[PDB]
Amino acid sequence: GLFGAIAGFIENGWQGLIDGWYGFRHQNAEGTGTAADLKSTQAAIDQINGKLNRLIEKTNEKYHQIEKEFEQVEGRIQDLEKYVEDTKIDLWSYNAELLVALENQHTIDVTDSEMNKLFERVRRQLRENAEDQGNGCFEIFHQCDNNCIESIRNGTYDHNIYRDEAINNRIK
Amino acid sequence: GLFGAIAGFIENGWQGLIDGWYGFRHQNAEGTGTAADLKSTQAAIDQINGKLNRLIEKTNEKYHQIEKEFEQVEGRIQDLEKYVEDTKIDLWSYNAELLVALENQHTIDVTDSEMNKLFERVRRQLRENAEDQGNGCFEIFHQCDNNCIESIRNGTYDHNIYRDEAINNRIK
Amino acid sequence: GLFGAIAGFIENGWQGLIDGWYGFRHQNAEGTGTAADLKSTQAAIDQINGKLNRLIEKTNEKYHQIEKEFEQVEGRIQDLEKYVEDTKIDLWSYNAELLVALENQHTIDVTDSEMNKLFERVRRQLRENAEDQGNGCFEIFHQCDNNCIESIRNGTYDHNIYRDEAINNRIK
Amino acid sequence: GNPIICLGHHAVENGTSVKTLTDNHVEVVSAKELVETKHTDELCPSPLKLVDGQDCDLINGALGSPGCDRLQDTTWDVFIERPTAVDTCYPFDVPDYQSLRSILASSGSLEFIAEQFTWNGVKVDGSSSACLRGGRNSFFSRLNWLTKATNGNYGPINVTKENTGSYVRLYLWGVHHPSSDNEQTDLYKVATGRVTVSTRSDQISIVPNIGSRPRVRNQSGRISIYWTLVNPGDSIIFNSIGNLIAPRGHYKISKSTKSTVLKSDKRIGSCTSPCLTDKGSIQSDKPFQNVSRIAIGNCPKYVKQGSLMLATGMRNIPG
Amino acid sequence: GNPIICLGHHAVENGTSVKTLTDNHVEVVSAKELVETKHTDELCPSPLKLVDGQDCDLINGALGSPGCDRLQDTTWDVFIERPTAVDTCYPFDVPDYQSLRSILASSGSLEFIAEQFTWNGVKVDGSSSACLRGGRNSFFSRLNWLTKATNGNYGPINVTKENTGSYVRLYLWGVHHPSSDNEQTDLYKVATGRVTVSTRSDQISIVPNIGSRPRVRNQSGRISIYWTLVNPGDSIIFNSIGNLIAPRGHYKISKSTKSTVLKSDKRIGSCTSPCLTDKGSIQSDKPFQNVSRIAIGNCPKYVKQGSLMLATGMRNIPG
Amino acid sequence: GNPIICLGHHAVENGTSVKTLTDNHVEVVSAKELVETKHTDELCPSPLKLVDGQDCDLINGALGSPGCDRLQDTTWDVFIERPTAVDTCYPFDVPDYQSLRSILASSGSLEFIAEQFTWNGVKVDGSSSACLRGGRNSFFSRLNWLTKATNGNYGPINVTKENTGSYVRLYLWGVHHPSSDNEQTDLYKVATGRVTVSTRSDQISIVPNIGSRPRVRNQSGRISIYWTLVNPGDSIIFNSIGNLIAPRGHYKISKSTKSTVLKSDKRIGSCTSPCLTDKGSIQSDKPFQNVSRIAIGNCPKYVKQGSLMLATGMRNIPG
Known part of the structure; x- marks a missing residue:
């Protein structure tokens, strides 16, 4: 994907993450835990559902048309009827092949994108309190109990609270 | 958008920014001010105009064709003439629907992209003199009068000049 | 491009880089050198080849069709045969024009993307040992002989080894 | 030892393969088939008369x-x-x-x-x-x-x-x-x-x-x-x-x-479908179809392909 | 109190809605209509004879x-x-x-x-x-x-x-x-x-x-x-x-x-237009048109839609 | 003086121009022509009889x-x-x-x-x-x-x-x-x-x-x-x-x-090609062609354009 996050700097996915598409996995003094991120999961799902609804809209309704199968050779008119139908089918098969390929390239980039937005959101919450470990993880340079972890996950984490502790730990 | 900058980490737009598409809003010892960024604004506008010129090129010129309206039922030939026309219209309506949707997805990503490039350009000018506040703003850890602000906006700002002041302010 | 790396914060390309698409150019105590990056080069090439293979697949095979050239005016049937053919040609010319334009927009974004992924990979290897100079270059705040340079290029560089040296050099 | 927090995404054991602009075979977490291949075998007498x-x-x-x-x-x-x-x-x-x-x-x-x-x-x-x-x-x-x-x-x-x-x-x-x-x-x-x-x-x-x-x-x-x-x-x-x-x-x-x-040979059933072919009825929400060029009513458009998978999830990377 | 500098973009009170690959209704700052819907009501005698x-x-x-x-x-x-x-x-x-x-x-x-x-x-x-x-x-x-x-x-x-x-x-x-x-x-x-x-x-x-x-x-x-x-x-x-x-x-x-x-019934005017329909003349730079399948000359291509908005600005976020 | 390491890409003296969604003329490092314009001038007797x-x-x-x-x-x-x-x-x-x-x-x-x-x-x-x-x-x-x-x-x-x-x-x-x-x-x-x-x-x-x-x-x-x-x-x-x-x-x-x-006038050669036109044979792997609407066999599809360049490399920036 264009962002290099999924199948990228994130080494792989979590078969255990069964209640969301994206999430946090933390390690702290009390142990470890995984939780889903709702916003990022919902953004992805919405866009995918959005494009799914767009594709179904039933707009093809045809009654009397032209014959498409023949019991005897006729020459000129039949050649035309056959050619017209074959032209149409080729053009619709083409439209379909290009639609999917392009409806897949984009979707995979969108999902890669959303993974990246989550990462970047967290990057910005933590300020100078953390460092990017290169693998989708931040090292957090201060004690961070379960409440503090959830404060990162729910977006109420105030970096000013731990800034002195964390900067001291990084710089020395 | 794929970059998460517009409708993303930038909380909203500025109805007051009426002389550009992107810009700087600063706060310093002398007060506050807004100014447009020309490069980023022009890049966006160029690409949008570029794709607008591409779409208008008048290439459809048809004279004698076939009848498309009929006063009496004829059977075989008429069925064909009607079917041919209906086939063509469906295919062109489809081309048009897909063109716009895809000409809109891309445009919105381009505009999101350009917003991000501006942000990143400024990020790089400031070096260790500033910190990302998470909302499109940098905190600049040194005094920065109106001349210094403009030096950021016009790309002549030398981070080496304030580096000692700024690093001291951040780390302590 | 959407990422602003090629024709962006990377000022230009290297006509001397003739054995890859992307690469490292370093300066250290022993001199200077350029080397290609294989992973990034291969990712780009693969995607371009991938889409090239997709486009060639020979699927158009037609024998008896309809006449497309005429020696005398006939009226109704001929008008139809001509109109059908002209309809088909317009639709295929359109498909072709849109395919290329879209097969070019994406390719250029992919190449821009891969350039960026390389940059970001290196950004993450170096941790707090380096600073982004804004032009695609990192300043590395410790001695880095030829072996150390290659350790960056081959992904075995351990930032922990130089962290104390580098942090001291940056902060003072 | 400092605390760490990792950002990740979900994956599954068995992915589904889709095509993109650059790749024939790409494994994603989920996908939906857009080409209808099955039909009822009887002609449905509703809602068409x-x-x-x-x-x-x-x-x-x-x-x-x-x-x-x-x-x-x-x-x-x-x-x-x-x-x-x-x-x-x-x-x-x-x-x-x-x-x-x-x-x-x-x-x-x-x-x-x-x-x-x-x-x-x-x-x-x-x-x-x-x-x-x-x-x-x-x-x-x-x-x-x-x-x-x-x-x-x-x-x-x-x-x-x-x-x-x-x-x-x-x-x-x-x-x-x-x-x-x-x-x-x-x-x-x-x-x-x-x-x-x-x-x-x-x-x-x-x-x-x-x-x-x-x-x-x-x-x-x-x-x-x-x-x-x-x-x-x-x-x-x-x-x-x-x-x-x-x-x-x-x-x-x-x-x-x-x-x-x-011109079909199939028996008229008691099923319901807004789309009839010479091969039977199509009951589908899919955009496209493999069944027949002969399609009357509200139908998926006939194509040549027997499969077109639309990705509906991210790339699947279980390992 | 340190100085700050913010990067932002422009927005407007009233946006325009467009469609994308994933969304039917997306508000952007500006858009242009690509489907011509109006016509002159008279047939223009120039430049066609x-x-x-x-x-x-x-x-x-x-x-x-x-x-x-x-x-x-x-x-x-x-x-x-x-x-x-x-x-x-x-x-x-x-x-x-x-x-x-x-x-x-x-x-x-x-x-x-x-x-x-x-x-x-x-x-x-x-x-x-x-x-x-x-x-x-x-x-x-x-x-x-x-x-x-x-x-x-x-x-x-x-x-x-x-x-x-x-x-x-x-x-x-x-x-x-x-x-x-x-x-x-x-x-x-x-x-x-x-x-x-x-x-x-x-x-x-x-x-x-x-x-x-x-x-x-x-x-x-x-x-x-x-x-x-x-x-x-x-x-x-x-x-x-x-x-x-x-x-x-x-x-x-x-x-x-x-x-x-x-075959039209409209009076020949004194207007100028390179595109005639049975419904009158089309004077437009738009790529597509709603007016008639019957279109002679240099015309927008007929489509079924009465509107296709092309976005020409970024997303509009006034609030 | 600290060591530096730069990331860069390759460029060439003479690029090739391609079209994109927004630009008519964009210089890239390499491109391949997708519209076949040449033909043999003789009709190839193989493999068609x-x-x-x-x-x-x-x-x-x-x-x-x-x-x-x-x-x-x-x-x-x-x-x-x-x-x-x-x-x-x-x-x-x-x-x-x-x-x-x-x-x-x-x-x-x-x-x-x-x-x-x-x-x-x-x-x-x-x-x-x-x-x-x-x-x-x-x-x-x-x-x-x-x-x-x-x-x-x-x-x-x-x-x-x-x-x-x-x-x-x-x-x-x-x-x-x-x-x-x-x-x-x-x-x-x-x-x-x-x-x-x-x-x-x-x-x-x-x-x-x-x-x-x-x-x-x-x-x-x-x-x-x-x-x-x-x-x-x-x-x-x-x-x-x-x-x-x-x-x-x-x-x-x-x-x-x-x-x-x-209906052609060209002499039957001894060449090999799976595609015949009234103008001669087409020997190409290109998807499209300029040569003739009259194309029999396994042929590139006829288009109006004489050139469609597919980019096959990144943007070319030599200076």
Whole structure:
């Protein structure tokens, strides 16, 4: 994907993450835990559902048309009827092949994108309190109990609270 | 958008920014001010105009064709003439629907992209003199009068000049 | 491009880089050198080849069709045969024009993307040992002989080894 | 030891493969098939109104051939012609057969509007052993076999009907081609017949030809079926000194009126589906379909591919 | 308190909604409509050359019917047929009427090339009360009604013209179908006429049929109009022992020559537009259009949608 | 002075220009042309099977005209008609010529199945100075010119053939249109001929017309060529009291069988290519092509553009 996050700097996915598409996995003094991120999961799902609804809209309704199968050779008119139908089918098969390929390239980039937005959101919450470990993880340079972890996950984490502790730990 | 900058980490737009598409809003010892960024604004506008010129090129010129309206039922030939026309219209309506949707997805990503490039350009000018506040703003850890602000906006700002002041302010 | 790396914060390309698409150019105590990056080069090439293979697949095979050239005016049937053919040609010319334009927009974004992924990979290897100079270059705040340079290029560089040296050099 | 927090995404054991602009085979977490490949095998009688020709095709149904009597006053969204349909009456041919078939199919109705005619100077209601109803001689129920008055002249025919109504009338009539000079005279007296049918703006004049054609149902003659439309306000005249196969009335043309004929062999079920093919019905929400180019109603568009997977999830990376 | 600098983008109070691959309704700062929906209501006489049939349609114009005399020597990019056009001459029909109409429309010219013919052994310039010019009997100005010499034979006709020129000639001729045996003989002597028109490579042979057709302008007979093309170097022969409706010359065929006919009812204005529809003219720079499938000239392509908004600005987020 | 490491990409002196969604001219490092513009100038005889009509077109080849004898028993994927092809036999015309040409082209075979016929009561193997073979009078090798028995009647014709085989037979037959009453009687005795050809389900009845047509190869008469198909199990009858141009057998119809005719003028080479145009052969792996709308075989799709560059490298920034 264009962002290099999924199948990228994130080494792989979590078969255990069964209640969301994206999430946090933390390690702290009390142990470890995984939780889903709702916003990022919902953004992805919405866009995918959005494009799914767009594709179904039933707009093809045809009654009397032209014959498409023949019991005897006729020459000129039949050649035309056959050619017209074959032209149409080729053009619709083409439209379909290009639609999917392009409806897949984009979707995979969108999902890669959303993974990246989550990462970047967290990057910005933590300020100078953390460092990017290169693998989708931040090292957090201060004690961070379960409440503090959830404060990162729910977006109420105030970096000013731990800034002195964390900067001291990084710089020395 | 794929970059998460517009409708993303930038909380909203500025109805007051009426002389550009992107810009700087600063706060310093002398007060506050807004100014447009020309490069980023022009890049966006160029690409949008570029794709607008591409779409208008008048290439459809048809004279004698076939009848498309009929006063009496004829059977075989008429069925064909009607079917041919209906086939063509469906295919062109489809081309048009897909063109716009895809000409809109891309445009919105381009505009999101350009917003991000501006942000990143400024990020790089400031070096260790500033910190990302998470909302499109940098905190600049040194005094920065109106001349210094403009030096950021016009790309002549030398981070080496304030580096000692700024690093001291951040780390302590 | 959407990422602003090629024709962006990377000022230009290297006509001397003739054995890859992307690469490292370093300066250290022993001199200077350029080397290609294989992973990034291969990712780009693969995607371009991938889409090239997709486009060639020979699927158009037609024998008896309809006449497309005429020696005398006939009226109704001929008008139809001509109109059908002209309809088909317009639709295929359109498909072709849109395919290329879209097969070019994406390719250029992919190449821009891969350039960026390389940059970001290196950004993450170096941790707090380096600073982004804004032009695609990192300043590395410790001695880095030829072996150390290659350790960056081959992904075995351990930032922990130089962290104390580098942090001291940056902060003072 | 400092705390860490990692950002990640979900993955599954078994992904699904999709195509992209650059890759034929890319594994994603989930995907949905957009090409419909299955069908019901029976034709669904709802919501489209079906009429099953059974052993009559549509034209035989319109002429009134011996097997077609259930085909009277029928109306349809789709008329179904069977491969088992057979001819049962006097052998006939229809110039531009396909267009008469198309015009009927489209009107969506076999409800005949019966008219009284006064054919002066001929015998009427001729019949034939080549057209048996219940073992006895009979004839297209909608056509009137005229012959010379018994023992005298084929009193010249000049009958006219004025379209006083608001709809376009379609008249079915024919011309008898005898297998010999004897038959011609025995039947029409004159040595050469002539049938001219006309309205104010169009007209149709036929001279029968006498000769041997292969025996069908023991008959070596033929009847040629023609048709004439008549707008409101216009008039049709039947002028003939011999060999006129006469009409008993007319059908109502409605315009482009959302009907058609399907040539399938499948049994009409009790299922529901808004899309019929010659292969059965399609019950799908998919945009495209593999089943048949012959698709009537609200259908997925026919394509050549048997599969087009739309990705509906991110890349799947379990390892 | 340290200085801050923020990066932002512009927004507006009222955005415009557009569609994307994933969203039906997305608000952006600006957008442009790509589907043209309006038209002028008059047909613009520039830059296309228009010729308004008024009360003559194109074929009546080519035959030379009583109302069509202003239609002589006319040339056009688009010929305009009106719904008020009427027949004014002897009742006639044209087999494959549509193809003659198409061939004329396309040649873009009603400039008749007059020829001298020597019809030996017949009366010439017949006329009819079914075709009145200025109250007096008259006839298609381009056709020559031949009858038997007065009081004697329909001296057999065998006239030939050689195409000595560089263009393809189109000959309009006809055949008279009489309403009775009396009329036939009174007019052509012979009991059965015959008209054969031929060139080296193609040929057309008709036997008139005698009978009653509905009265039109008091006439119960008909004339059937035929046409014959003649390449440079080839010859046409008119051979007839009766019922020939003869030509007075021919038209010049130019090939696929950027002409056509439009059937509209709208008045020709003084506006300028390179695109005509049956509904009026389109003056637009938009790629697509809602107005009509019938679009002649340099036009936006017809689509079904009444709106397709192209985004021309970023997402609009005022709040 | 600290060490630095820079990330960069490769560039070239001379880029190539491509189009994108927003830009007409964008310089990239490399690109590949997707529109094929060149062709071989000769028609490649492999892998498609070619048969060069030379001086016979396909119908003349099927009738058996004097120049066409090498056209016997030939088979093809593509039959090549030349602009130099000439008529060499008695002047004839074919109603719906194009459909007979299309039906032949598609069957891909000129291998005639010869039949024995017993034409009772006529002279056979007529010949003409308008159809010379080796300086002597001769006739379509596949047709049989019948005339009245010498010095007596055109004993009535009623011959029948039953299709006992498994393939559809195509019968070529004609009708002679004499230039005078003398010729008619001298040849067929009767004053008016008649030819009726029929199978169980279809039939064709013609009355010849007598008159002058432009002299071709000194002949003022014509022959009209007709055709009749016959399904397995069906029978065809030839019934005629005069002017029958009789068949000597029939051709085998294969269905939609991957054949066709190309009208080109280019010499057949010794090259190899799976794609033929009227302009020569296309040897390309490109998706699209500029060369001709007339493209037979495995070909790039015809487009209007002479160039469509696909980018295959990043943006080129040498400076």
